[PDB]
RNA sequence: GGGCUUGUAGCUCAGGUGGUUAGAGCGCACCGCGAAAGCGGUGAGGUCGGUGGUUCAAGUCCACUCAGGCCUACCA
RNA sequence: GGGCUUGUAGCUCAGGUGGUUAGAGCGCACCGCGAAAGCGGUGAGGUCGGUGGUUCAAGUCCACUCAGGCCUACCA
């Protein structure tokens, strides 16, 4: 099932700065995050617990859904979500393969 | 503008290996790349040649758009496209954090 | 930007393996025949688009060039 | 899973930060008045949801518990 670019288009791939992560009370698999995209900070829920620590992600550059409508997950409002690979063993984050400044829009 | 998850479920975001890279004949800009995802392999045309010799592109994993209806340039039918992030200075493409095996769905 | 193809008599065309081999039909001029459409006979008509090569020998092979038709590229 | 709140007479409720202070309106019973809708008078009605505590003093504060209502979590 095919897709124009127009369809593409309509998502903001963005490249967020973590600034803090922490483990979310209750929970096994999630963590909650605060990211600057340059002008501005995000919160976001990310159900990786169970493969990244916390202090391993913070300074990270990471590839996000910057336009996705909030939800609130476990109480807290995410505002976005972080895009992750898996293969069925391994889970991974997203990132630039070379340093560019937080807000970079991916195209 | 917000867009909500069947928005973005729509778009199918993959890790790929690439196996080969060249020049354009007679394009300023362009490299034609096969990829793998795994079972299978795509061909594809990335405006990138500016920021990337063939030879640091081969062997690499990176993150494409895999459902595109394919579209011909400089005669080459590309059928998909890699995914770069640029902040007006440096362009980068896009690459899983740990390695995964290619064909992984990004979600 | 990159290709394919065509260019020979006034017009439409023939001329495979370089030599056999530059001709046909229509048209034109003249002489006959026919009621007419037409037919017979005798002729005239050629920068083989142009230039340079190859070869004992080029319309024919190679390269450059001019003109008409057509296909394709122009930046995930 | 995490919270907030209510529980007092047959019903709906008062008792605001421990003592003043467990009462009201409706309803019920009896006695009168009125043409009637109604009114006056006299009464009955209480495990203050249950248990254990604190204090000179608990409906009131603490802890446990039972029942009703409502808010919220349940995996980017």
Do not use: H, W
């Amino acid at each position: 099932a095919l897709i124009g670019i127009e369809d593409f288009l309509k998502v903001d791939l963005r490249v967020a700065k973590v600034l803090s992560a922490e483990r979310v009370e209750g929970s096994e698999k999630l963590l909650k995050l605060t990211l600057s995209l340059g002008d501005e900070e995000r919160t976001v829920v990310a159900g990786i617990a169970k493969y990244y620590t916390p202090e391993e992600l913070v300074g990270k550059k990471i590839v996000i859904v910057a336009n996705l409508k909030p939800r609130k997950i476990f109480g807290i409002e995410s505002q976005g979500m972080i895009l992750a690979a898996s293969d069925g063993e391994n889970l991974s984050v997203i990132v630039p393969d070379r340093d560019v400044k937080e807000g970079a829009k991916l195209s």
